[PDB]
Design a protein around this nucleic acid. Structure first.
Ligand SMILES: [Zn+2]
Length: 607
DNA sequence: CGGTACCCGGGCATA
DNA sequence: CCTATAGATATGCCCGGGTACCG
RNA sequence: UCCGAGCCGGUUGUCGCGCGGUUCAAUCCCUGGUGCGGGUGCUAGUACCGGCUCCGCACUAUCUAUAGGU
């Protein structure tokens, strides 16, 4: 549901100036971060080591058992039969992993809450990693085996050869992905490069539903695909393809956010017996360590603190929880539920309408009916957010600390071979002490929190400037990055949710409009037969491409050659235009046509 | 010295 | 540095450590 | 892996213009903003006329982890 919110504040303003409590909390979060990292590494090691017999069906019990083992040793005494069996199976592998890494059991007490939270988080990471990326990686492997990389340089752009190649590509995938039932003659209709693909795909033991497609089966029981997914990465390793993280790893040594609640408070922070804690109200028990009067803890939209924070030693994210909280395909409509054509009744009553074109450099280029232009570029975000300022010093310190030569030697972590994974673990352990000392510096977390502060300030200033230029109330109509080869969820509508969310937070209505044929029409003559693009050339701006002698045609510059737009005095012979200006003018024309009821003009249509 | 039963705090199960 | 998913705690019961009393 | 923004021109609604001119923005410390009252101070003219800075009331801002993309 949508019954929760978060407010992030600084560590100093969160906890009262009690040095003992702060030190206890810092030690606890460091221990929890170490436990989580070692648990992820041990889970991957166990999964790799058991491939010789069978890929285990990892369960929440598995993660909980791994965490409890790393924490205690053989002292864990679960009473549940499933947990007991998982403990018995995992103990040798965890022992070997600890011996290889030299990990010493922290013997932390009261591990129930933290272990449960980390188990839930890791299982969620497995579920999400298996849900979507499984199909995408399978399709990527199928494309790579067919050598589409080379075929793109072998087939004419539109000739019948490319059509036949596309037909074959879908024909093979339908049988491989269980989309269409094959006939017997399909057996002999396979070249060696295709027979190998069929055999490899079938060797993954893809689970499926007899009455539903593979994609629906993935959504229904995504975790059942976790074993096959682990197999898939192995193939990527055999053929040298772009490897993917089959089993997620918490590589970073920078102190990560750790969950703290009332139970953890009275177990490790306040250090009081449960019988004493149970006799005091939750809020009264929290005030002893946290300044509830701070702005971050105030209620919003009927939500209350409810004793949940996540802290990493530099910033604290306080979660506000609604009383109706959970207490621990049709969706395609959302693709077009927000588009302008379905929201015209609301657009007609908007005080002002602003059309925005996104670009990889001009992240926003906004124009209104009055012609007042505005833009928010990637340079402004990079400078104000401090991303480059932090990057040029945090990465530079590696020269002073010499850790750059350490991280580079680390082999790729996505390997699936047990020997290679052991090599990676040993190499990471070799210089683990120096990296741990380096990342313990407050500067890393301080920059991570200052980045959030700067991004929030930049986002607020952007809205302030937009309101100042266009007015207090306005409706945003933005393009969807349409092109001649973008027709899927992965490419068009997924690259705009950030700005839609940003506008929603400020209660600014945002709608999407088709960007197709936006750069075709000249508004001054409403004609596309006399529009020229990419005529002039200049040296490349990027420092490495520029020194290679590469010359690039201007992308954002367009021209109109129709005589009606040309003054006889102009020696250029063409009226110049900016790509963003023309796109905004065309979007304004389309919106005006839609509002009047005439609909999208035929010239901008996909006919 | 040798052998019992209770109160407490910690640990684990569960939705 | 961008985008996407799931989940975003609390109560009850078992047990094992130490302390109390008789022969 | 290198990059600020506003404005006037070369310019005609023109560029990642390594084109010219001019204004502030930034370096460090800071969770941001909105509407309401005072409370030291700093600014231009005889309480007004404001702007920067704090105090206090409610209105609001979804983060963790991983993964993918570069
Ligand atoms: Zn024209």
């Amino acid at each position: 549901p949508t019954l929760h919110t978060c407010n992030k504040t600084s560590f100093a303003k969160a906890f009262l100036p009690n040095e003992t409590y702060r030190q206890r909390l810092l030690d606890y979060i460091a221990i929890i971060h170490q436990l989580a990292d070692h648990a992820s590494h041990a889970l991957k090691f166990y999964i790799l080591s058991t491939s010789t017999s069978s890929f285990p069906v990892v369960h929440e019990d598995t993660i909980e058992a791994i965490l409890y083992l790393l924490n205690k040793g053989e002292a864990w005494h679960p009473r549940k039969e499933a947990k007991k069996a998982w403990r018995d199976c995992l103990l040798p592998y965890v022992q070997r992993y600890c011996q290889i890494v030299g990990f010493i059991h922290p013997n932390l007490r009261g591990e129930q809450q933290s272990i449960n939270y980390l188990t839930v988080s890791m299982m969620t990471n497995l579920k999400v990693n298996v849900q979507e990326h499984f199909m995408q990686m399978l399709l990527r492997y199928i494309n790579l085996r067919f050598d589409v990389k080379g075929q793109k340089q072998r087939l004419p752009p539109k000739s019948d050869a490319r059509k036949a190649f596309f037909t074959r590509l879908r024909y093979l995938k339908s049988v491989f992905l269980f989309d269409v039932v094959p006939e017997l003659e399909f057996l002999d209709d396979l070249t060696p490069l295709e027979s190998e693909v069929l055999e490899e795909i079938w060797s993954l033991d893809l689970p499926f539903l007899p009455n539903d497609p593979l994609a629906y089966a993935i959504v229904a029981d995504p975790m059942s695909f976790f074993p096959a997914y682990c197999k898939l990465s192995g193939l990527y390793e055999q053929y040298g393809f772009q490897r993917f993280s089959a089993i997620p790893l918490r590589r970073s040594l920078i102190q990560s956010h750790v969950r703290i609640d009332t139970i953890i408070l009275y177990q490790h922070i306040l250090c009081i017996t449960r019988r004493d804690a149970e006799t005091v109200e939750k809020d009264d028990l929290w005030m002893r360590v946290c300044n509830l009067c701070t702005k971050a803890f105030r209620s919003r939209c009927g939500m209350h603190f409810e004793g949940s924070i996540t802290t990493d030693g530099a910033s604290v994210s306080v979660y506000l929880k609604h009383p109706e909280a959970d207490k621990y395909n049709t969706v395609a409509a959302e693709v077009k539920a927000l588009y302008v054509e379905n929201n015209l009744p609301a657009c007609r009553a908007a005080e002002n309408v602003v059309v925005i074109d996104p670009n990889k450099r001009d992240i926003l280029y906004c124009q209104d009916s009055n012609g007042t232009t505005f833009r928010y570029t990637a340079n402004q975000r990079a400078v104000e957010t401090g991303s480059r300022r932090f990057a040029k010093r945090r990465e530079a310190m590696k020269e002073e600390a010499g850790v750059d030569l350490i991280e580079s030697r680390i082999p790729s972590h996505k390997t699936m071979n047990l020997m290679d994974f052991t090599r990676y673990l040993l190499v990471r352990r070799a210089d683990w002490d120096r990296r741990k000392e380096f990342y313990s510096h407050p500067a890393h977390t301080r920059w991570k929190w200052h980045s959030f502060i700067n991004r929030q300030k930049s986002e607020s200033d952007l809205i302030s400037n937009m309101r100042n230029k266009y007015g207090e109330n306005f409706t945003v109509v933005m393009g969807d990055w349409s092109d001649a080869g973008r027709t899927a969820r992965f490419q068009t509508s997924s690259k705009t949710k950030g700005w839609r969310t940003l506008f929603k937070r400020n209660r600014i209505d945002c709608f999407l409009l088709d960007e197709y044929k936006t750069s075709s029409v000249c508004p001054r003559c409403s004609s596309s037969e006399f529009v020229e693009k990419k005529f002039k050339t200049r040296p490349h701006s990027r420092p490495w491409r520029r020194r290679e002698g590469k010359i690039e045609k201007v992308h954002g510059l367009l021209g109109c050659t129709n005589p009606n737009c040309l003054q006889q005095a102009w020696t250029s012979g063409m009226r110049y235009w900016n790509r963003d200006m023309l796109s905004t003018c065309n979007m304004l024309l389309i919106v005006r046509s839609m509002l009047d009821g005439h609909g999208r003009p035929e010239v901008f249509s996909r006919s």
